[PDB]
């Protein structure tokens, strides 16, 4: 049903499936054609098997500018979470090029900030996997605010927790 508990669990399983496949099949194809891997494939290569715990998987943007609200993909264009690399704690974010060309948005940015706050809070490295066309223009200045917030964390975490940038 839906109004039943079982129905709600099935509803979750449906959303999970939509979230893990946020990008269109065609977008994924082009990504692979360019000899590039997907955001989730990269995280799986980095983290120890089964250690990945995704954060903000169902995040969605709040913009209505230039018809952007027509499409609100789960995760909003970046896969984030934590796990282990060789048994040691690591926080990670992986930009998804198949979603809006990976253009950095407001929620997209907040997700990376959460990953960074988490790493600073628990004292673990942050591995950022980059693959983005640029700022999500439709969001105007909100896009720049997200950048600024990230820049500040980068500076404050400088020399405190290791920060590695994987630009693919």
């Amino acid at each position: 049903d839906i109004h039943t508990t079982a129905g709600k669990l099935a509803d979750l399983r449906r959303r999970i499936e939509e979230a893990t496949h946020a990008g269109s099949a065609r977008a994924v194809e082009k990504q692979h054609a360019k000899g590039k891997l997907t955001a989730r494939e990269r995280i799986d290569l980095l983290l120890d098997e089964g250690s990945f715990v995704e954060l903000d998987e169902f995040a969605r943007h709040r913009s209505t500018n230039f018809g952007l609200d027509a499409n609100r993909p789960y995760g909003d264009g970046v896969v984030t979470g934590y796990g282990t690399v060789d048994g040691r704690p690591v926080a990670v974010f992986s930009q998804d090029f198949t979603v809006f060309g990976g253009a950095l948005g407001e929620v997209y940015g907040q997700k990376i900030v959460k990953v960074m706050d988490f790493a600073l809070k628990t004292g673990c490295p942050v591995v950022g996997i980059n693959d983005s066309g640029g700022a999500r223009i439709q969001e105007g200045v909100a896009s720049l605010g997200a950048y600024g917030e990230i820049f500040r964390r980068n500076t404050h975490a400088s020399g405190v927790i290791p920060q590695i940038s994987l630009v693919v």
């Binding site: 959303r15 250690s51 998987e57 169902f58 995040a59 704690p89 929620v107 997700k111 628990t122 673990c124």
Partner: protein, 353 residues
């Protein structure tokens, strides 16, 4: 044994007080005096016996059947705490098996279909703790909220959980104070806190207001907001209004906030909401005043009475299958154990009293 006069204030200041049924008593003023001053006739047992202080006054934390069990209870209490605030609680590390068990699965069906039928939060707690062992404190006081100790992977953790079986899990003055002190106790001694949420709001009542719920209920929010130990929150079902804020919400500083598919995170009940949002829309056309409202209500609950809007905003880090609660808590505590945070410098806070 007896604890009379100003003597009672010493145990009051200590962290946990354990009494014995019908063989221990605490009271500031004796029956004799209250009688000649108030004309009230009360026996020692009714005035300040173990049962009275364990379920009515909120002062004692446990009522044992005999001294032998009472001593055993403190030993247990000590087993969950560090020798002092300089170290983490004692642990006997043992890696857990994270594969889904038949027990984990049970969780997927623990929440009934009707938003009203209650379920025992004790089961939820046991399913996440090692050997399903949950050491409860203050069982007889404010039964609407549960507090206690357990272990995850051999490491001590504290627990705070609304109990749908009593007052439908609503918070009130007593539950707020019971939980507030426990959270602060765990935090002072570096014990992580796991909270399970199913709260429809605060118990309504003139008495609640007059008795000072505004300042007494604030105690719980202050406790969570002040805490620097790891905090993981799981919303199993209801979480409305301020109550949602109070129960270890991310806004207070919780590190990991999980919500089951059955969670309902909203400002207020659907009916109470639609009555305000659609006051005029329903006002018009007295013709069929109600199926339309029952429709507006149905629509409001189908659209907002779930955890997805909170998820969109990151208020909850994840919406998970109930059967995966143990895994999230286990893997969450592993990362969170190195958490280091501090409050602004001060001699001390000014928590509401």
């Amino acid at each position: 044994g007896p604890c009379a006069g100003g003597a009672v204030y010493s145990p009051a200041i200590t962290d946990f007080t354990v009494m014995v049924d019908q063989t221990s008593h605490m009271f500031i003023t004796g029956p004799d005096v209250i009688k000649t001053v108030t004309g009230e006739d009360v026996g020692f047992e009714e005035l300040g016996g173990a049962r009275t202080h364990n379920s009515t006054s909120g002062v004692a934390h446990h009522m044992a059947g005999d001294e032998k069990d009472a001593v055993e209870y403190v030993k247990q209490l000590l087993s969950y705490l560090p020798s002092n605030n300089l170290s983490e609680p004692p642990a006997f590390p043992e890696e857990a098996d994270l594969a889904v068990t038949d027990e984990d699965a049970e969780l997927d069906t623990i929440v009934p279909d009707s938003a009203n039928q209650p379920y025992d939060m004790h089961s939820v707690i046991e399913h996440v703790l090692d050997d399903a062992e949950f050491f409860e404190t203050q069982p007889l006081f404010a039964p609407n909220i549960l507090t206690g100790f357990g272990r995850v992977e051999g490491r001590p953790v504290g627990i705070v959980a609304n109990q749908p079986m009593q007052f439908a899990g609503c918070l009130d003055i007593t539950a707020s104070e019971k939980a507030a002190r426990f959270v602060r106790t765990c935090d002072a001694f570096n014990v992580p806190v796991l909270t399970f949420v199913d709260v429809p709001g605060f118990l309504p009542g003139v008495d609640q207001e007059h008795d000072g719920i505004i300042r007494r209920g604030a105690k719980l929010i202050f406790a969570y907001a002040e805490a620097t130990v790891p905090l993981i929150t799981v919303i199993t079902r209801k979480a409305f209004g301020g109550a949602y804020d109070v129960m270890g919400s991310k806004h207070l500083g919780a590190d990991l906030n999980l919500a089951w598919p059955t969670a309902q995170i909203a400002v207020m009940g659907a009916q109470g909401a639609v009555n305000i949002l659609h006051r005029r829309t329903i006002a018009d056309a007295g013709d069929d005043a109600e199926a339309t409202r029952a429709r507006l209500i149905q629509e409001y609950e189908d659209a907002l009475l779930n955890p997805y809007t909170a998820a969109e905003r990151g208020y909850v880090d994840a919406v998970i299958m109930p059967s995966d609660t143990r895994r999230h808590i286990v893997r969450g505590l592993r990362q969170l154990r190195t958490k280091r945070e501090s409050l602004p410098p001060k001699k001390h806070g000014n928590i509401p009293l």
